[PDB]
Amino acid sequence: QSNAYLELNEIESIIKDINTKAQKMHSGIHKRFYLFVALMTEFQALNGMRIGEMLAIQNEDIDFDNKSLNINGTIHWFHDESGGFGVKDTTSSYRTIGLSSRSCEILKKAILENKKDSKWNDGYLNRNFVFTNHKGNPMQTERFNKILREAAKDVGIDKEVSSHILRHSHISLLSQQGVSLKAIMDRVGHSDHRTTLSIYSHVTEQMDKDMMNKLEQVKLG
């Protein structure tokens, strides 16, 4: 839609709820799921990629020195020869975007958890994915979304929620910060431009309506 996004503070509150669930948990498997969904929720709100793209991120795709991420495939959901579930497709939404410092922490945290489980948990088959379940597979979309809805509801948000709304939220954020439609698309990808353009329009129209309000603040004498 046109109003199909969340406010930063709504998302913050979602992430805090999920982290809270993560902390009460005893099962390490459940803890990892909730921990990671919290990371993924923030990451997507802060970077705007599709969920399929975020699930496909691998260690080599990140460049922490230059604070950039190379987005170059999505998940195909079938088993590879090793039993691993979910395989990366390399096969033109391909792009390189910039990572904030926060986004880098998020990635480092994911990778740290992954090094540890790789090393200590026999069931964790490292295939170099970053956002993984306890088996080292890219987390399944349906699972991420389920946890996200449940949190959103628990937190009293009324809107329907899913990974899409997070991507939309990032587009809404870039709009509010005065980024141009073209720059937003370089970052978020040229796919589904109708939706992107629809959000851009809605937001920039609110900003225009706020014009006299902002000018009210300006006194020079």
Add this chain to the structure above:
Amino acid sequence: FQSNAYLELNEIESIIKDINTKAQKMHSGIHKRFYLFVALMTEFQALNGMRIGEMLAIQNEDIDFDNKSLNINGTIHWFHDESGGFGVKDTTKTESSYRTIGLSSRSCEILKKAILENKKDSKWNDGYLNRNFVFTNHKGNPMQTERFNKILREAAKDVGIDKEVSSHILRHSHISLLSQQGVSLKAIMDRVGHSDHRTTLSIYSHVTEQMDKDMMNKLEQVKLG
């Protein structure tokens, strides 16, 4: 098109302050009046973005203080009317940039100040020919643009601005401000009119290009856990 192409808010603020400071030091009531009015005009154009000719053509009846709006319906033509008033308001339709714009409280304040001063003069000063203009000299005429520019220039010099200045830069400054506030080009255009749109366009593009470059810098402030 450049940073020399408009003024920062604080540069405008210094200019106004310098102009008012000069006004306070003056003996001649006529000179003090010019300076006081140049200062009001400088702020008003910076806050509103009209061309100087349109600002000079503002009359009491064009202002709607209750709805905080201004009706921009004419510009000044520099010739004498049949009573000897210099500068006449032209409202011809074809040179149409006519528009209604919103005024801020400060802009309203500014207008009320100028009008109050004109009322004093209209009542006491025999040589004030009252034609309802707001931004006037002591004869009741719309102030001449060169006398505004000359004072504006000296203010800029004295305050250390090393840009080329005239009324235009104030209009450009307003456009720059609305661009930094994330106002769409369509909205800017409705407020400031379509005249010299090549310039409006180039300012908007320059600023929006700056804002795009500042993207990562802005995002660095975003943290949600």
